[PDB]
Design a protein around this ligand. Structure first.
Ligand SMILES: *[C@@H]1O[C@H](CO)[C@@H](O)[C@H](O)[C@H]1NC(C)=O
Ligand SMILES: *[C@@H]1O[C@H](CO)[C@@H](O)[C@H](O)[C@H]1NC(C)=O
Ligand SMILES: *[C@@H]1O[C@H](CO)[C@@H](O)[C@H](O)[C@H]1NC(C)=O
Ligand SMILES: *[C@@H]1O[C@H](CO)[C@@H](O)[C@H](O)[C@H]1NC(C)=O
Ligand SMILES: *[C@@H]1O[C@H](CO)[C@@H](O)[C@H](O)[C@H]1NC(C)=O
Ligand SMILES: *[C@@H]1O[C@H](CO)[C@@H](O)[C@H](O)[C@H]1NC(C)=O
Ligand SMILES: *[C@@H]1O[C@H](CO)[C@@H](O)[C@H](O)[C@H]1NC(C)=O
Ligand SMILES: *[C@@H]1O[C@H](CO)[C@@H](O)[C@H](O)[C@H]1NC(C)=O
Lengths: 27, 337
């Protein structure tokens, strides 16, 4: 993966989110 | 020549009808017996291009393992797309077995035998086989377990090393044993993993040499823990004995150039993000007794930060296709005539 929510969560760490298959991964 | 083609691969294994472990049960219905008369045939004066990053064998294995899990490991509650299903959720016996992939009539599996092989481009030592070697369908993040070792050196592989968004698949040439245990007994969800500190440190040093060879000998190589995201990928997650272990890998991935065991703290979780499809599943609390798996670490999935002087690598994974790729990289299917 749910990309929007992944980006939502990672951005609050100062990182972009991206999918890793069906998982959220911060970068 | 033999054009790469998509076909119905079938599977073969040593599954036993009398074994209620879930891989055995699935295989009993879905697979044939392992080939009793294997035949590899060297193809003389044949060069063939491979591309491990676009190999339909990977997609077929992926769909088989999803089916195996979906039939075998039933959660009590599953949430997908805002819809909830609940069902009976018995605990099961779970220990992966090797599965072989086989080409039917009119098709062949080609196998690259070159020692260096980076996964893409021409191969000058090619053979045909009826079936792949036996591959255990291990679902995990960060570390690749119980797989196949490189023959004489560590090899690192990526669809594009210069692109920091592409996962680097590391194949070790010496495995490092890891023992993970939820003790028989306290806290039923508390577990841990032990591995040799000197073996792991020597492994990191050797990977770093290979990363330098790829990125530049002026580079200083740093490993750091995951930058964050789902627990599944921040930790080393895997299934042992039917329970989902989430192991803190910070100690494995905090390293720069300048006791005897590393003990990783772990938790058994009931609520997991699914790998099969986007959603969450809830399982029943762990069984009683000692829950223990002893595994060979045979490879790793890394990501590189990119974006100077230094290169930081972090543990990765998540897309299980790269796990399948780590074993299928030397094979492709072609249509005869
Ligand atoms: C080609 O690969 C096979 C299997 O690994 C090996 O036995 C054979 O010696 C190789 N041939 C050459 C010329 O390298
Ligand atoms: C693998 O080797 C080929 C040459 O055979 C090379 O062109 C290709 O770039 C390599 N793969 C990489 C760098 O990912
Ligand atoms: C673990 O590695 C050792 C040595 O590399 C090997 O003998 C053993 O069969 C491996 N176990 C599995 C399950 O692959
Ligand atoms: C494993 O590969 C490394 C290179 O990465 C090499 O130094 C070492 O001798 C190899 N050892 C074995 C047992 O294959
Ligand atoms: C590899 O990735 C880099 C960075 O995205 C890109 O500029 C380059 O063109 C890629 N090489 C290919 C696709 O051959
Ligand atoms: C892992 O367990 C095996 C026996 O199953 C043992 O020989 C080995 O020493 C253990 N390794 C660690 C690091 O605990
Ligand atoms: C993992 O272990 C490290 C080292 O103690 C710690 O800093 C980190 O908080 C741990 N992660 C979690 C989720 O507890
Ligand atoms: C690795 O293989 C050993 C031997 O079959 C097994 O006990 C262990 O559970 C396996 N590990 C994983 C993660 O499947």
């Amino acid at each position: 993966x749910n990309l929007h929510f992944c980006q939502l969560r990672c951005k609050s760490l100062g990182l972009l989110g991206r999918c890793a298959x069906t998982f959220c991964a911060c970068v | 020549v033999w054009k790469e083609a998509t076909t119905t691969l079938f599977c073969a294994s040593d599954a036993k009808a009398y074994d209620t472990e879930v891989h055995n049960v699935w295989a009993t219905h879905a697979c044939v017996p392992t080939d009793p008369n294997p035949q590899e045939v060297k193809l003389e004066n044949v060069t063939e291009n491979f591309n491990m990053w676009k190999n339909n064998m990977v997609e077929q294995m992926h769909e088989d393992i999803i089916s195996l899990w979906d039939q075998s490991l039933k959660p009590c509650v599953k949430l997908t797309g805002g819809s909830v299903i609940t069902q009976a959720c018995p605990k099961v016996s779970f220990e992966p077995i090797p599965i072989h992939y086989c080409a039917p009539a009119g098709f062949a599996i080609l196998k690259c035998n070159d020692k260096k092989f980076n996964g893409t481009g021409p191969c000058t030592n090619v053979s045909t086989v009826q079936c792949t070697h036996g591959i255990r369908p291990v679902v995990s993040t960060q570390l690749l377990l119980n797989g196949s070792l490189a023959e004489e050196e560590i090899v690192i592989r990526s669809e594009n090393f210069t692109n920091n968004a592409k996962t680097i698949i590391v194949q070790l040439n010496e495995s490092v044993v890891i023992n993970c245990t939820r003790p028989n007994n306290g806290d039923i969800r508390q577990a841990h993993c032990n591995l040799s500190k000197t073996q792991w440190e020597n492994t990191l040093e050797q990977i770093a040499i290979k990363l330098k060879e790829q990125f530049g000998n002026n580079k200083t190589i740093i490993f750091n823990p995951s930058s964050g995201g789902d627990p599944e990928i921040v930790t080393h997650s895997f299934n042992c004995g039917g329970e989902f272990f989430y192991c803190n890998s910070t100690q494995l991935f905090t390293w720069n150039d300048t006791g005897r065991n590393i003990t990783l703290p772990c938790r058994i979780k009931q609520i997991i993000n699914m790998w099969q499809e986007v959603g969450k599943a809830m399982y029943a609390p762990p069984i009683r007794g000692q829950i223990r798996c002893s595994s060979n670490i045979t490879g790793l999935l890394l990501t590189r930060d990119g974006g100077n002087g230094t290169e930081i690598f972090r543990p990765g994974g998540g897309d299980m296709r790269d796990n399948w790729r780590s074993e299928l990289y030397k094979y492709k299917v072609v249509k005869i005539e």
